[PDB]
Paper text:
Cell-surface expressed contactin 1 and neurofascin 155 control wiring of the nervous system and interact across cells to form and maintain paranodal myelin-axon junctions. Defining subfamily features are extracellular six N-terminal immunoglobulin-like domains (Ig), four fibronectin type III domains (FnIII) and posttranslational modifications, i.e., N-glycosylation at multiple sites and a C-terminal glycophosphatidylinositol (GPI)-membrane anchor. All four members are type I transmembrane proteins with six extracellular N-terminal Ig like domains, three to five FnIII domains, various predicted N-glycosylation sites, a single transmembrane spanning helix, and a ∼120 cytoplasmic region with a highly conserved ankyrin binding sequence. To address these questions, we structurally characterized the contactin 1 and neurofascin 155 interacting regions, i.e., Ig1–Ig6, individually and in complex.
Numbering used by the authors:
A (entry chain B): 37 to 604
B (entry chain A): 69 to 117
C (entry chain D): 136 to 237, 248 to 359
D (entry chain C): 304 to 471
The structure:
Amino acid sequence: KGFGPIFEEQPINTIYPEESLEGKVSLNCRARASPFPVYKWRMNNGDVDLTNDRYSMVGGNLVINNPDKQKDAGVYYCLASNNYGMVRSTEATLSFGYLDPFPPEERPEVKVKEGKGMVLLCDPPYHFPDDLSYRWLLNEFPVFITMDKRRFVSQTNGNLYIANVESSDRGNYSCFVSSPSITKSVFSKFIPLIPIPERTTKPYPADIVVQFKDIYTMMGQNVTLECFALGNPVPDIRWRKVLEPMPSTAEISTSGAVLKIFNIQLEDEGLYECEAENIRGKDKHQARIYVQAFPEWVEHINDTEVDIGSDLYWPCIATGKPIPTIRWLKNGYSYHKGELRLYDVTFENAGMYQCIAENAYGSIYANAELKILALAPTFEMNPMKKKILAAKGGRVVIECKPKAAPKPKFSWSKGTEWLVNSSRILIWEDGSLEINNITRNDGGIYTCFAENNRGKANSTGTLVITNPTRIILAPINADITVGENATMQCAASFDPALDLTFVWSFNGYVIDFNKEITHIHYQRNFMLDANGELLIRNAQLKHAGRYTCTAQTIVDNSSASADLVVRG
Amino acid sequence: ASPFPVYKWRMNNGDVDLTNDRYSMVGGNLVINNPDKQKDAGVYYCLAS
Amino acid sequence: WPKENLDPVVVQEGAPLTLQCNPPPGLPSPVIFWMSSSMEPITQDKRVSQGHNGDLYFSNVMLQDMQTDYSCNARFHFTHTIQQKNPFTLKVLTNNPYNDSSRGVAERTPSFMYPQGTSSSQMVLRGMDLLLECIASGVPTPDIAWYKKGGDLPSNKAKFENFNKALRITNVSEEDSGEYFCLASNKMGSIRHTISVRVKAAPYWLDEPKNLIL
Amino acid sequence: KFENFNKALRITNVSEEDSGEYFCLASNKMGSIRHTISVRVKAAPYWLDEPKNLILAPGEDGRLVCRANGNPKPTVQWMVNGEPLQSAPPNPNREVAGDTIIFRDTQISSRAVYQCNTSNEHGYLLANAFVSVLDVPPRMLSARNQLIRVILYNRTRLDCPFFGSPIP
Ligand SMILES: *[C@@H]1O[C@H](CO)[C@@H](O[C@@H]2O[C@H](CO)[C@@H](O[C@@H]3O[C@H](CO[C@H]4O[C@H](CO)[C@@H](O)[C@H](O[C@H]5O[C@H](CO)[C@@H](O)[C@H](O)[C@@H]5O)[C@@H]4O)[C@@H](O)[C@H](O[C@H]4O[C@H](CO)[C@@H](O)[C@H](O)[C@@H]4O)[C@@H]3O)[C@H](O)[C@H]2NC(C)=O)[C@H](O)[C@H]1NC(C)=O
Ligand SMILES: *[C@@H]1O[C@H](CO)[C@@H](O[C@@H]2O[C@H](CO)[C@@H](O[C@@H]3O[C@H](CO[C@H]4O[C@H](CO[C@H]5O[C@H](CO)[C@@H](O)[C@H](O)[C@@H]5O)[C@@H](O)[C@H](O)[C@@H]4O)[C@@H](O)[C@H](O[C@H]4O[C@H](CO)[C@@H](O)[C@H](O)[C@@H]4O)[C@@H]3O)[C@H](O)[C@H]2NC(C)=O)[C@H](O)[C@H]1NC(C)=O
Ligand SMILES: *[C@@H]1O[C@H](CO)[C@@H](O[C@@H]2O[C@H](CO)[C@@H](O[C@@H]3O[C@H](CO[C@H]4O[C@H](CO)[C@@H](O)[C@H](O)[C@@H]4O)[C@@H](O)[C@H](O[C@H]4O[C@H](CO)[C@@H](O)[C@H](O)[C@@H]4O)[C@@H]3O)[C@H](O)[C@H]2NC(C)=O)[C@H](O)[C@H]1NC(C)=O
Ligand SMILES: *[C@@H]1O[C@H](CO)[C@@H](O[C@@H]2O[C@H](CO)[C@@H](O[C@@H]3O[C@H](CO[C@H]4O[C@H](CO)[C@@H](O)[C@H](O[C@H]5O[C@H](CO)[C@@H](O)[C@H](O)[C@@H]5O)[C@@H]4O)[C@@H](O)[C@H](O)[C@@H]3O)[C@H](O)[C@H]2NC(C)=O)[C@H](O)[C@H]1NC(C)=O
Ligand SMILES: *[C@@H]1O[C@H](CO)[C@@H](O[C@@H]2O[C@H](CO)[C@@H](O[C@@H]3O[C@H](CO[C@H]4O[C@H](CO)[C@@H](O)[C@H](O[C@H]5O[C@H](CO)[C@@H](O)[C@H](O)[C@@H]5O)[C@@H]4O)[C@@H](O)[C@H](O)[C@@H]3O)[C@H](O)[C@H]2NC(C)=O)[C@H](O)[C@H]1NC(C)=O
Ligand SMILES: *[C@@H]1O[C@H](CO)[C@@H](O[C@@H]2O[C@H](CO)[C@@H](O[C@@H]3O[C@H](CO[C@H]4O[C@H](CO[C@H]5O[C@H](CO)[C@@H](O)[C@H](O)[C@@H]5O)[C@@H](O)[C@H](O)[C@@H]4O)[C@@H](O)[C@H](O)[C@@H]3O)[C@H](O)[C@H]2NC(C)=O)[C@H](O)[C@H]1NC(C)=O
Ligand SMILES: *[C@@H]1O[C@H](CO)[C@@H](O)[C@H](O[C@@H]2O[C@H](CO)[C@@H](O[C@@H]3O[C@H](CO)[C@@H](O)[C@H](O[C@H]4O[C@H](CO)[C@@H](O)[C@H](O)[C@@H]4O)[C@@H]3O)[C@H](O)[C@H]2NC(C)=O)[C@H]1NC(C)=O
Ligand SMILES: *[C@@H]1O[C@H](CO)[C@@H](O)[C@H](O)[C@H]1NC(C)=O
């Protein structure tokens, strides 16, 4: 009653604040097995000393007290072992979050002409978490500077871009960065900005400063496009595709300088054109979008069990834009690096197999237990039913399905006869036994023998034959009008030992007689030694059709049909 | 009430000394510290004026 | 901020709420205020508002409140740094019947929330800015009015802040010392809280010594 | 034995034999898991040799033994008529060493009741012992001319109790 290690929870790539309250950091590895899983961890593809006061362990989860940049940063992986083999967790990279504040420098006061925009550097300091959200503020913190076609805030550089300057744009301006990962928000020194007023403001052409470059990104991702230009007349920005239609999943937004793509598909690949215009002139930028895809499963493997010596093929299939490479780890180490077609299974092969699909980009795991069988046959679980019934002139079939390992050979024995493939008698390979057109001499004592390389098993069967249940009087066809009372005739002959029933069917659908609706028009009155007729009251158009009487017992069943026509 | 209610309590149809360290009051609710069989048992009623 | 696991708090339509910040130790006391994670400044009015202590107070929760999350934020003057507490969320419950043939909820008395009990004591130093707060809870948005024991409020120096829930004075002398109280007037009921304002004075120059030339 | 539907295990009198490492399995169809417990069998002090009363003739040598076994080892504390040994009336015959007290050439002097408190973190044990000096001839403590009966192949006993100032 064995069972291999199976994972529930696996570790994730993780990040710890340098200046944290928490002095403890933790990684999860959770699994289940019949012999409890035993856990090992490795650091940078190298062993870790288990008890160091600093380091400690709890139920597969690893703990470090007072972790240090200098020491603990690296890639950790978790090995769940038992008696049946080893299984590697997903690679988990551990880093220390870094977010120093800005350079303390004074930022010079800024003077500009009305009608000419300008741009200010955030000066982003060192950061280990890269999920940076940028905005800009005025005088005091809570004030916020909003997106128009005039003003914009880059989400990559972190700077602020203005096309057209007005008297309202004067005052203090400060950068603002938030890291949601570590929940930290910091802001740069304020910069004074003054626009000198100018009447009959000097017009300037469209001038592209913010591009969106050739990018390789994965299937199904969120993707966002920045495109911005400058000039005295508020520049108008327009998006299109070169030589294809825009993807359905496109949203333009109010600003008209930012473009959303939900669920990038195969077809979106190619060039995208951004046209920045104004009253005076124009400019264009063309960008390359390359679609990729992480490896994603199609027929991931599952827990399989087979016999020894059987020729095996493991179907493992994933799909990626970069064609996936397949690796086969046996108990936490690579065993095969190609089509896992195996011949001549053995003792030692059995256990834990890991199918990994990695490309140039990403990797995905699939774990499976391959179990091996070599049991002697027993009838403990699926024994033979001792007693079986038969009628003359009818095909009859007997199950001999026990539980053996190497798919052994079969035999049947009638006391003083060995029975084999014949004209009317066949033993199909699954182990069951067929007989056609039975006779009185067939009834008797049969034994099923299951003959295995390693041991055999024998079960006993007793087979009795009875006088067949047949129909003496068949139903006769009838024609009537609407509202008539009709009768269908049926008589059968049978053996006293047997338990017999009568079943009436309409148009090859059995009347159940179990619900009150049917009894409205239909009635049954079985009597005598043979008599089993049916009555119909208040005939309708729908009632006309085929009526079949079936005399059914546990040995065989005999059927006979007739027709009913309705007029009016 | 529009002019907030003011509370008085009476013990055995008799007035109660308000601050006795023992006795104390909060928002119309009356409190006794270390109550004694000998002393505090009785019928109390509350007057909202 | 200490990384804490936050289940969102729930409420039936129109019950009172006290949303607690409790920052890690802060010298000086940081600038406290409330933000959405969407980075939008959060709805503040007479009905619902933030305390000087930094917690947020809902006299009565409404339907709309479910729209967005509420996150506490604290600025430290010197390092120019802001700390963001893990954001909260709320859920509302409606028992209103579906009136046939086309606020369907119960109205309720006011109650005191921040200054529990009738009485409290505060100490402010002479010349300092004096600041008092009173927080109520009634289904019809209560109105806070501030007054003083047997004396008129100095209108030149005092003013209402934070939608009538804060009173602020200028330099405080022994004149201003005494007993101040606050009314949470509401359609259904009304209640007073008293505060003992004892003004104790920091040393100040009567005759400052000047240089002697002889 | 099993108690509480196999979720509790109980043992009788415990010794250092039973000390060690015990664990428990939560076998189940889906998974199974072990918990380990370090069973350190420590002990409140218990008497290995309890000091029994010393009867001596003038000039005979006696020693008091206070040996209690405990885990951790129990600390021995010596008092004389409930007075600290430090400030007790000085005696030349008396010699204290480790856990043992020695009187060589004992005399009428220093006749008192000595107390031993063997204690540790967990518990303590207290023992008293006194020395009595008398000068009497041997005495017979049972009935004269006893009659005792017994069968052939069975164990038997004759009780002839006695006592004397020097061990007779
Ligand atoms: C990157 O891209 C991913 C998408 O791949 C973004 O993922 C987003 O995640 C959130 C969180 O799961 C999704 O939010 C959901 O929000 C709905 C709230 O809306 C419901 O109520 C609205 C008001 O009545 C109503 O307008 C909604 O219907 C609109 O929106 C849906 C999409 O939600 C849209 O498909 C419709 O056409 C409408 O326009 C909707 O009725 C909330 O109900 C969801 O919770 C349900 O499902 C969760 C399980 O997911 C379940 O646990 C709950 O009990 C409940 O049943 C869910 O929170 C959001 O939709 C995703 N964005 C999408 C799909 O575009 C991710 O945000 C992007 N990155 C960044 C950084 O933003
Ligand atoms: C004594 O007599 C018995 C009975 O006649 C003999 O047993 C017969 O042996 C033959 C030959 O081996 C078997 O035919 C094989 O069938 C295989 C397919 O088996 C599956 O399907 C069978 C039928 O199922 C039908 O319906 C399903 C569901 O709709 C369909 O999917 C299916 O296609 C059929 O239409 C099932 O009965 C069976 O359990 C399986 O599920 C074939 O794959 C097989 O061909 C292979 O092997 C050949 C050599 O054997 C080889 O030439 C081929 O290239 C290929 O490799 C073969 O055709 C019968 O199944 C089996 N039982 C019968 C007929 O009842 C027995 O051998 C004989 N003893 C002797 C001669 O010593
Ligand atoms: C005087 O003292 C002697 C010796 O001490 C006593 O003899 C004992 O008598 C008892 C019976 O009262 C004996 O118990 C016997 O046990 C036998 C089995 O002994 C073996 O297994 C036991 C454990 O079950 C071991 O402890 C032991 O070592 C042996 O290995 C039974 O077979 C006996 O029953 C049969 O024989 C007796 C004989 O007297 C018959 O009367 C019974 O009807 C029966 O047929 C018996 O039960 C015990 O073993 C003896 N020895 C000891 C050392 O105790 C006398 O009892 C005592 N009084 C007299 C002699 O009057
Ligand atoms: C904190 O508050 C306390 C309490 O109010 C202040 O302390 C004392 O307050 C009393 C008022 O209760 C003052 O008494 C006043 O004294 C005035 C003296 O006149 C000079 O000072 C006036 C301002 O106090 C000033 O306006 C005046 O000039 C005016 O008239 C001129 C023409 O004549 C004109 O040109 C000027 O521009 C101006 O309009 C004089 O300079 C008197 O005039 C008042 O009527 C009143 O009697 C005390 O003086 C206050 N104590 C002191 C030491 O001055 C305390 O000052 C407050 N502290 C702060 C920092 O505000
Ligand atoms: C827990 O408490 C018990 C009870 O007090 C302690 O048992 C004492 O153990 C000591 C040390 O072994 C014994 O001294 C031995 O005595 C032997 C004689 O034992 C026979 O007679 C017993 C009745 O008096 C009888 O129970 C015993 O049979 C049992 O033990 C046999 C051991 O061989 C076993 O074969 C039998 O099947 C049965 O289980 C004997 O017939 C003697 O042979 C030894 O040489 C030695 O002198 C004490 O006698 C025991 N106590 C009693 C009352 O007999 C035990 O040590 C305690 N354990 C802890 C950890 O504290
Ligand atoms: C399949 O075919 C094999 C080989 O013929 C059968 O093996 C023996 O079959 C006979 C049939 O009569 C069995 O006798 C039966 O015993 C039943 C109860 O079993 C009792 O004996 C068993 C062992 O006996 C064997 O070993 C002794 C050793 O001294 C030999 O002397 C015997 O000859 C036997 O070989 C015990 O294990 C069991 O606990 C019982 O005490 C009884 O109910 C039946 O009425 C009948 O008398 C014989 O037991 C079989 N022996 C073995 C080893 O299998 C086999 O039974 C057949 N199986 C079936 C299902 O038919
Ligand atoms: C944007 O950044 C700018 C960068 O400096 C900044 O100037 C601007 O606002 C603040 O503006 C105030 C005044 O409005 C400045 O304060 C002044 O400081 C002077 C010395 O540096 C001082 O002499 C002056 O004094 C005035 O008042 C006294 C009476 O009290 C009178 O006697 C004098 O004659 C003057 O009239 C005044 O105090 C700040 O220095 C300045 N910078 C800050 C606060 O950082 C920023 N805000 C906006 C909206 O543009
Ligand atoms: C393995 O899983 C696939 C996908 O669910 C399923 O089609 C297949 O039948 C499974 N095979 C086994 C042996 O469970």
